[PDB]
Structure 1
């Protein structure tokens, strides 16, 4: 009876999580372990409210905004929700193109051209054809996740710094830019618009969906913490050339995977980016339909999302660096998504007999308060550091 939360863990591991966990351990050691533990517990409460909203109300967060809020406010949220989709695909479409570079040696541009063909072709496939591929990409992402669960024990990390990595201690502005990037990688604001896509029958799924969320977020947190702790035991404190970048993250699993660490890491990173970008493009289409009632052709949405990725490549920026930036932008979109979440789930005309418990609503606002604080904390040091 164990399986649903495995699927959610492999779907949660996107290239955005790889870039933040590897860089978080290489440049800052274990000192960001508390960020991963805090973001997961935040995402447990956040993604639980997102699922409770869809079971009771029957609609999704975009649909409720379209039917209840004034038009100028619906357009603003649709534009805000449209930028969260572009920042999500920018982390996944670029991650697949980066894995192509680690496998074949193709440049970043041509690696995106191959990623562009796969993303276009994968959208035309039906639900019955992608079923084997969903298990194929699930296999590689799962084994690479258990690889870090075993290696974190075999790497023999300095437990004095591991346990001390759970006290919220700051390391300047660079720690905040990356701590914010970890929150955006875990919460995933676009899911807050996507997850939601008879109290005996409606509180039944709230009992069933709640089990899958807490169990899956548990392993995803263990995998993310293990990956950050292995990268800390590998590159941190040793002055490695270009440490933290995804071009050398395979060396974290060299003593475990032997000479197969580079291929098994890029393949698991390619399967993670190809699946999350095709599903992310499908998710962005339902979001626009919920806000505006109409939609653009899916090929046009797929092409517009590639333009910022090709522009970053044509400029010469570091692929691993722009993946972390996209996760920071997502964390600025979390407060904009939590507000329609904490308000709709706390209305009796919207939920019915499933009004959110008064304790979870207050905690959810404090989570938004902390993220607003952490976003406001960061946003100062950039221009006056």
Structure 2
């Protein structure tokens, strides 16, 4: 009624400031300063449009994106969509689980194993907020997102960034490879597929309506909510870029990508509090997006398949890759890479059904996405798919 879809929007935004974005934005600032801010902005406004379509999809149609895929498309393709999404929600949760567990290690020093054990029970409880209703989880991530922003505003004011150099960083341009490659990373690996499905689910039948006029009133309300929540995610990501830029650019800081070193190098540069507020930000970022990713996986199979496995069981499965990595002891290289391959793999599968169904009257009724805007969504999906193919190309090889 007032802000009906902020919750759904905030649950969707947290995936766009997950630990994955922390490492990317940190390395972005550390290596090339502010010269990539325009990429974070452009990437965020693109996702802002995407998540707005998924939200509108659930509002107008009263069915989440996996639901419409289940009833409209053959079950061979649906079963693959369930498996595809499950791997995407699982690969995504991995970088969020490990990032959360890493944050605990930075705060207490416990081995990554127990840090992951802490991440499990806590991330589990965050989904018993989901068993009954959903508002409680929406405040949970809301309060978490709130502690991600204040953590990086106070870091920005500490990093003392050169607004002239921050503004110059918003001019679309780059200088050679690496900078260009990392920009392609931000464009390609920003849209989170698992949240494209979930967002429509948190909006379906959220406000019971029985007309076509009352629905479009929700579409206009939801639009402000998505832009507000997604816009927030951008500024935060821009903050993570500027802080790293305002601290590591010309400081001989190498290997700044991984967070276990940025946390360390922050103490002698900014201060010990800059490191703590960075670790808690990472912690809150990992717990939330992991819990959201777990709820995403729940509505994913519920919508694609119908049947529903216990959340604790689902929590346990997605929790195994993390411990496998910890008990193994590999570098984020093979981890951060292999996982983002699956996300880049699942981006197209999330946007193609979204742009199509949102352009059908048998799904949307009189709330079909304006043709002029359906186009803008496809050109957005094309370059993201294109740049996902390039990334996917560059790692796999060819």
- Which TM-score bucket, shorter chain as reference? 0.7 to 0.9
Contact preservation (8 Å) 1:100, 1:106: yes
Q: Deviations over 1:190-242 (max 9, x none)?
A: 11101111122101110100011112222221221122011012112221253
Q: Retained in 1: the 8 A contact 2:148–2:236?
A: no
Range 275-284 or range 157-166, more displaced? 157-166
Tell me, yes or no, if structure 1 residue 130 matches structure 2 residue 134: yes
- CA positional deviation for 1:126: 6.3
Moved more, 35-44 or 322-331: 322-331
Distance 1:81 1:132, change over 3 A: closer
Q: Superposition pairs for residues 82-231 of structure 1, below 5 Å?
A: 82-124=86-128, 138-139=142-143, 141-149=145-153, 151-152=155-156, 155-158=159-162, 161-169=165-173, 174-175=178-179, 178-183=182-187, 186-197=190-201, 198-231=211-244
Residue 207 of structure 2 is matched in structure 1 by none
Contact 2:266/2:274, CA 8 A, preserved across alignment: yes
Deviation at 1:329, TM superposition (A): 3.6
Q: Which runs of 5+ in 2 are unaligned?
A: 202-210
Alignment CA distance shift 1:71-1:34 (3 Å): same
Whether contact under 8 Å (2:130, 2:137) holds in the other structure is no
Per-residue deviation, residues 148-179 of structure 1 (Å, max 9, x unmatched): 33544564445565344334445666446643
Determine if contact 1:26/1:232 at 8 Å carries over to the other structure.
Answer: yes
Distance in 1, Cα, partners of 2:219 & 2:44 = 19
Q: Give me the whole-angstrom Cα distance separating, in 1, the residues matched to 2:253 and 2:180.
A: 22
| Residues 1:324 and 1:99: Cα distance change in structure 2 (over 3 Å) | farther
Shift of 1:80: 1.6
TM-score (norm 1): 0.87
- How many Å apart are 1:356 and its aligned residue? 0.8
What is the CA distance between 1:99 and its match in structure 2?
1.1
In the alignment, structure 1 segments of 5+ residues that lack a partner are none
8 Å CA contact 1:235–1:244 kept in 2: the answer is no
Aligned-partner Cα distance in 2 for 1:236–1:114: 34
Q: Deviations over 1:59-91 (max 9, x none)?
A: 000011111111211112112211211122112
- CA-to-partner distance for each residue in 1:271-311, whole Å, 9 max, x for gaps? 22223222321221111011111133333322221222122
Distance in 2 of aligned mates of 1:221 and 1:289:
30
Between 1:211-220 and 1:53-62, the stretch displaced more is 211-220
- In terms of mean alpha carbon deviation, does 122-131 or 288-297 score higher? 122-131
Please say which of residues 270-279 and 155-164 is displaced more in the overlay. Answer: 155-164
Pair 140,108 (structure 1): closer, same or farther in 2 beyond 3 Å: same
Secondary structure of 1:4 counterpart:
helix
Query: Contact 1:54 / 1:196 at 8 angstroms: preserved in 2?
Result: yes
Aligned residues: 385
1:363 alignment partner in structure 2: 376
SS in 2 for 1:27: helix
Counterpart-to-counterpart distance in 2, 1:316 and 1:254: 26
Is the Cα contact below 8 Å between 1:245 and 1:321 reproduced in 2?
no
Distance verdict in 2 for CA 1:381–1:218, change over 3 Å: same
Q: Distance in 1 between matches of 2:7 and 2:197?
A: 24
Classify the secondary structure of the residue corresponding to 2:352: helix
Contact 2:341–2:392 under 8 Å retained in 1: no
- Preserved CA contact (<8 Å) 1:230 1:252: no
The farther-off stretch of 99-108 and 233-242 is 233-242
Instruction: Say if 2:339 is the partner of 1:335.
Output: no
CA contact 1:288–1:294 (8 Å) conserved in 2: yes
The two structures, once aligned, show a CA RMSD in angstroms of 3.4
Distance 1:105 1:183 in 2: 34
Equivalent residue, structure 1, for 2:311: 298
Shift of 1:383: 6.0
Check conservation: 2:247, 2:269, Cα contact below 8 A.
no
Given that 2:361 and 2:368 are in contact with CA atoms closer than 8 Å, whether structure 1 keeps it comes out as yes
Kindly tell me: are residues 153 and 70 of structure 1, through their superposed partners in 2, closer, same or farther at Cα, counting changes over 3 Å? same
Alpha carbons of structure 1 residues 348 and 85: separation in structure 2 relative to 1, 3 Å: same
Q: Check whether the contact 1:137–1:268 (CA below 8 A) recurs between aligned residues.
A: no
Pick the aligned partner of 2:301 from 288, 291, 310: 288
TM-aligned CA deviation for residue 255 of structure 1: 9.5
Task: Identify if the C-alpha distance between structure 1 residues 361 and 128 changes in structure 2 by more than 3 Å, giving closer, same or farther.
Answer: closer
Distance in 2, matches of 1:299 and 1:203, equals 37
Identify which range, 183-192 or 322-331, moves more after superposition. Answer: 322-331
> Does the 8 Å CA contact 1:15/1:323 hold for their aligned counterparts?
no
